[PDB]
């Protein structure tokens, strides 16, 4: 009873202040959002079906390029990595800061969102990639032109790096719910996609395989979790659009936790919703960098 009312008050008042601080932070931000951010990306002359054709055509620098995978639709912007693993990599996903929101609905994920590239300062062209999702229709169309390999890279907050390479990667069209398929793995990050979390056993490990899964968003449940409570859905809890099973071993489109380490009592729904890759850092570490790139196989 004594010191009890002493501390219990030192909390209520401390918290009442934190709230005012948050109210102001959010109020300032809402103000900054009256004006948009801007980029100026002059377009390279050299173009092609994808980034591998561009590199072969002489495009040597990493920056945004215009590509036309097919004469059906209009050419579109993309960031090409021409230095990593012999270049010719078309980036379809990228996380590096937390500049973009990835907890989006089905339509945005179908059409693509985020910023493909930004200005490298004192440069008329955009040589730095932004954070974005290319878009499921475009991803599917790209992986269906011919055999395709997938390169996944990540980095922790200390600078250590690992990768996951899949010699085969395909995403079906929307009619098949953008179903995924990957094979021929080789890497140092752990084959999370085909095998599921390594620190899990039997059935529990199996329900984290992504290979074979359909795509899901918080407003479109196609996961491998059979349930009734509309709240119990991988996308709603783990916060991103992804080929969720029940639920994941890797959540590259998760929430961007600053610093890396986070706890269940920090997560919105109490789950490991960060930019995760269990097979390397477990569920409670959120990568500093994450990206997915593709390139015609051969």
């Amino acid at each position: 009873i004594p010191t009890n009312l002493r501390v219990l008050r030192s909390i209520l008042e401390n918290l009442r202040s934190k709230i005012q601080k948050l109210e102001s932070d959010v109020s300032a931000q809402m103000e900054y959002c009256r004006t948009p951010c801007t980029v100026s990306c002059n377009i390279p002359v050299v173009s092609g079906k994808e980034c591998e054709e561009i590199i072969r055509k002489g495009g040597e620098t990493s920056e945004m390029y215009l590509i036309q995978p097919d004469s059906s639709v209009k050419p579109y912007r993309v960031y090409c990595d021409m230095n990593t693993e012999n270049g010719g990599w078309t980036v379809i996903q990228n996380r590096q800061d937390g500049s973009v929101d990835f907890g989006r609905k089905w339509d945005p994920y179908k059409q693509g969102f985020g910023n493909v590239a930004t200005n490298t300062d004192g440069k008329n062209y955009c040589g730095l990639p932004g954070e974005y999702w290319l878009g499921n229709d475009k991803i599917s169309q790209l992986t269906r032109m011919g055999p395709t390999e997938l390169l996944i890279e990540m980095e922790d907050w200390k600078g250590d790096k690992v990768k996951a390479h899949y010699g085969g990667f395909t995403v079906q069209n929307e009619a098949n719910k953008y179903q995924i398929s990957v094979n021929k793995y080789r890497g140092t990050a752990g084959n999370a996609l085909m095998d599921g979390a390594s620190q899990l056993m039997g059935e529990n490990r199996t329900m984290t395989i992504h290979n074979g899964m359909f795509f899901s968003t918080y407003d479109r449940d196609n996961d491998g979790w059979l349930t009734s409570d509309p709240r119990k859905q991988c996308s709603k809890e783990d916060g991103g659009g992804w080929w969720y099973n029940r639920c994941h071993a890797a959540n590259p489109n998760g929430r961007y936790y600053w610093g890396g380490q986070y706890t269940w009592d920090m997560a919105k729904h109490g789950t490991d919703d960060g930019v995760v890759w269990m097979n390397w850092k477990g569920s409670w570490y959120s990568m500093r960098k994450m990206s997915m790139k593709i390139r015609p196989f051969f």
Binding site: W225, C247, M278
Partner: peptide, 4 residues
């Protein structure tokens, strides 16, 4: 993660 899983949902056992």
């Amino acid at each position: 993660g899983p949902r056992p």
